[PDB]
Design a protein around this ligand. Structure first.
Ligand SMILES: *[C@@H]1O[C@H](CO)[C@@H](O)[C@H](O)[C@H]1NC(C)=O
Ligand SMILES: *[C@@H]1O[C@H](CO)[C@@H](O)[C@H](O)[C@H]1NC(C)=O
Ligand SMILES: *[C@@H]1O[C@H](CO)[C@@H](O)[C@H](O)[C@H]1NC(C)=O
Ligand SMILES: *[C@@H]1O[C@H](CO)[C@@H](O)[C@H](O)[C@H]1NC(C)=O
Lengths: 108, 121, 241, 278, 49
């Protein structure tokens, strides 16, 4: 099995800010990885598949960049609807693992 | 485009098996594949199984042999999972997700609302 | 050529190309060793003549089957998925893409038709998925005996040999019609020189002479200048006006 | 699509072309040279058809022939564009030119044009219902007491569409004016008919006073006099009058006293017959 | 990058089409001239008259 983790576990961001989330696997998984956003209480929606492709309807502001064993998702201009839980999933080889869950919050 | 509807929340004793349904409506059904993914309250995501009914390939998680089986019905255009040997730690919500041939099977383009399955005494 | 995913061989894409300038030399940088078979036209002289439209068809096939994409070829992909006309002109470019279209578990998103009632007329698409009744008993849509699902999947894996690894194939088709040609390649250029007897070319105009600064004032659309004796004496530089 | 039945049927008017309809044949610059060229032109002092718009609603479908000379006396931009095609339906390819207040749109698709297409602030474009196969698009700068006299020449030669244009401030005025090249397009289709496009100011809608004229071109030989600045200042038709033919033959605008040999005549056959054995 | 080997191979196979099957070519070039012809075709000599 591929054991994979994302950094940081919790990140505090603000509206209009540019932030990044990194996601690294144990070994090479080629470019098979997908990203998902989860508002607490509802089902996740996919944003990026193949670590580069932008889904139809997903805003183009979200950016994915990665080759293998390291991937990054970057937000240039953040909006209050971007505070959610971000999840990676690799689909190279069977037993598809997931991410821990990164929470994006405002500064109190 | 495609609406995904799951079953309701179910409460059952751990000594039994649970069957959960998932209906997808929209477009051609023969080009779709179904994955079942878990969501526990105290931690994140874990995938169990992926099914391609038109090509008939089943692939379950390494820690789920002999406990869950997922099948698809063409006439009703639905998917079903049956899980046996319910354990106390197996109380959580289930999401039925769908992948498309145009794109990738492993990725899940659409997601269901989920079913809260709980076990206790 | 750099798209993330190509369509399946049976449902092969069709792309039209017109009103553009193409530099095919870059196509030599795809792979260290790759097939570049061209029919009816020399590859090194594709930057000189030009056509009215270009047709691009891209998909992915098993490696050892690559020889089936040619005029007059026979087999399974040749007659059930993609057939080329015998009187075909253009090029076919196939290169290995094992690093991009291989899954350790195994890719299943690439499908090819296996059973068909008849052969395929060249440049024809068949996306039908209705069950094939091999025998005489009408199964009416069940994959039992003598009833097989026509589409099968290439279980691509990186551990496979070179004879079964996926290969990306792109076919370019050219043709000539009465409509004016528009898809022509680059024409290059050279720095200007003045006050010296030189041989020059200006937009297909040959000549020999001395270029000097001109006091004549052309109209905005005027290109050439002719004297009393009906000879060229004034020219306009295409790059800098 | 909206059907209009408020038309007032009147016969088309006719007027005299005078000496209008001369354009630069090519890209070559010449100064102080009298040059004779054979090409499609509009004959001098010929019939030219006249249409009014005011409740005059004149939008007939005119034949294209080998070329069209289109003149318009107007102010405040009533005319908006043109339509070209063979069947004016999605069965065959169709060409659309429009010039709204934003910019100029050139498009080539299988349009399903409305029976009475037009424009109706004006943002109501009842011109077509669908565009299935689009094969060419182009966008460029806008072309724009009656104060506007707008002159256009449309030609279709071996797959190329040539449009020449001219704009002047002021029946047809008496004068001479060379038409400059404007647009060349590699359309590569067949055109046998065309239709004009107007804009209606909603008030329902009121059409202002405007007029336009249509003439047809055919091949002939002209003599053109370039000034020292390369601008055509005068032209002579070599097939209008015997004096004109003499001027063309001598390649000069003035002929001295005498007798000159111009050409020869021969009566043409009237009909044809055939005789073969039993 | 941008450094290509200039020689390629004719991967001839019996299953190719007519347009790619190998063809053997022999070009005969002459230099017809007034010099003593050392190569002459089959003819017959005749007595000098
Ligand atoms: C052509 O390119 C040169 C340099 O790139 C530039 O200086 C010049 O303005 C250009 N002219 C046109 C007509 O594009
Ligand atoms: C224009 O046409 C009318 C009738 O159609 C004719 O009487 C008139 O002579 C024509 N114009 C000229 C200049 O011949
Ligand atoms: C228009 O031209 C095409 C070829 O350019 C020809 O096939 C067609 O018959 C023409 N249409 C008419 C009405 O003559
Ligand atoms: C030609 O142009 C010059 C200056 O550009 C001007 O002085 C002269 O009057 C022009 N000639 C004519 C006939 O307009």
């Amino acid at each position: 099995d591929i054991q994979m983790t994302q950094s940081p576990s919790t990140l505090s961001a603000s509206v209009g800010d540019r932030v990044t989330i990194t996601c690294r696997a144990s070994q090479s998984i080629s470019s098979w990885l997908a990203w998902y956003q989860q508002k607490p209480g509802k089902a996740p929606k996919l944003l990026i598949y193949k670590a580069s492709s932008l889904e139809s309807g997903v805003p183009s502001r979200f950016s994915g960049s990665g080759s293998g064993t390291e991937f990054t998702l970057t937000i240039s201009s953040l909006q209050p609807d971007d505070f959610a839980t971000y999840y990676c999933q690799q689909y190279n080889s069977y037993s598809h693992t997931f991410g821990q869950g990164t929470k994006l919050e405002i500064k109190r | 485009q495609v609406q995904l509807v799951q079953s309701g929340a179910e409460v059952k004793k751990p000594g039994s098996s649970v069957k959960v349904s998932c209906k997808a409506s929209g477009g051609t059904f023969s080009s779709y594949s179904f994955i079942w993914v878990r969501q526990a309250p105290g931690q994140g995501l874990e995938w169990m199984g992926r099914i391609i009914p038109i090509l008939g390939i089943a692939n379950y998680a390494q820690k789920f042999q002999g406990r869950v089986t997922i099948t698809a019905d063409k006439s009703t255009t639905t998917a079903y999972m049956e899980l046996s040997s319910l354990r106390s730690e197996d109380t959580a919500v289930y999401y039925c997700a769908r992948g498309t041939e145009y794109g990738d099977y492993d990725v899940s383009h659409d997601w269901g609302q989920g079913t809260l399955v709980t076990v206790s005494s | 050529f750099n798209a993330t995913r190509f369509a399946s061989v049976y449902a092969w894409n069709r792309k039209r190309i017109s009103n553009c300038v193409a530099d095919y030399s870059v196509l030599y940088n795809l792979a260290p060793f790759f097939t570049f078979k061209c029919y009816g036209v020399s590859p090194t002289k594709l930057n000189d003549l030009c056509f009215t439209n270009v047709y691009a068809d891209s998909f992915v096939i098993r490696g050892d089957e690559v020889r089936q994409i040619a005029p007059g070829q026979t087999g399974n992909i040749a007659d059930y998925n993609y057939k080329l006309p015998d009187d075909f002109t253009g090029c076919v470019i196939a290169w290995n893409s094992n690093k991009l279209d291989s899954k350790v578990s195994g890719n299943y998103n690439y499908l090819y038709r296996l059973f068909r009632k008849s052969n395929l007329k060249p440049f024809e698409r068949d996306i039908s998925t209705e069950i094939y009744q091999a025998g005489n008993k009408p199964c009416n849509g069940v994959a039992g005996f003598n009833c097989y699902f026509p589409l099968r999947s290439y279980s691509f894996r990186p551990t496979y040999g070179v004879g079964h690894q996926p290969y990306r194939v792109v076919v370019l088709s050219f043709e000539l019609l009465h409509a004016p040609a528009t898809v022509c390649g680059p024409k290059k250029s050279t720095n200007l020189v003045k006050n010296k007897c030189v041989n020059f070319n200006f937009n297909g105009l040959k000549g020999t002479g001395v270029l000097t600064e001109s006091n004549k004032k052309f109209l905005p659309f005027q290109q050439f200048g002719r004297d009393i004796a009906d000879t060229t004496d004034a020219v306009r530089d295409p790059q800098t006006l | 699509c909206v059907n209009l039945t408020t038309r007032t049927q009147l016969p088309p008017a006719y007027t005299n072309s005078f000496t209008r309809g001369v354009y630069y044949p090519d890209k070559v610059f010449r100064s102080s040279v009298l040059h004779s060229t054979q090409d499609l032109f509009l004959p001098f002092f010929s019939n030219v058809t006249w249409f009014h718009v005011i409740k005059r609603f004149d939008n007939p479908v005119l034949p294209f022939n080998d070329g069209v000379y289109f003149a318009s006396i107007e102010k405040s931009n009533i005319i908006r564009g043109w339509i070209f095609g063979t069947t004016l339906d999605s069965k065959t390819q169709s060409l659309l030119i429009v010039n709204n207040a934003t910019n100029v749109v050139i498009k080539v698709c299988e349009f399903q044009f409305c029976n009475d297409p037009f424009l109706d602030m004006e943002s109501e474009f009842r011109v077509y219902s669908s565009a299935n196969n689009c094969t060419f698009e182009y966008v460029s700068q806008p072309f724009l007491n009656f104060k506007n006299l707008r002159e256009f020449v449309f030609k279709n030669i071996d797959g190329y569409f040539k449009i020449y244009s001219k704009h002047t401030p002021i029946d047809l005025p008496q004068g001479f004016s060379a038409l400059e090249p404007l647009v060349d397009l590699p359309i590569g289709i067949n055109i046998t008919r065309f239709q004009t496009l107007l804009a209606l100011h909603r008030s329902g809608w009121t059409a202002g006073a405007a007029a336009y004229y249509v003439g047809y071109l055919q091949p002939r030989t002209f003599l053109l006099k370039y000034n020292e600045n390369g601008t055509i200042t005068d032209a002579v038709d070599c097939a209008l009058d015997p004096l004109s033919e003499t001027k063309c033959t001598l390649k000069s605008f003035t002929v001295e006293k005498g007798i000159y040999q111009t050409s020869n005549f021969r009566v043409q056959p009237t009909e044809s017959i055939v005789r073969f054995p039993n």
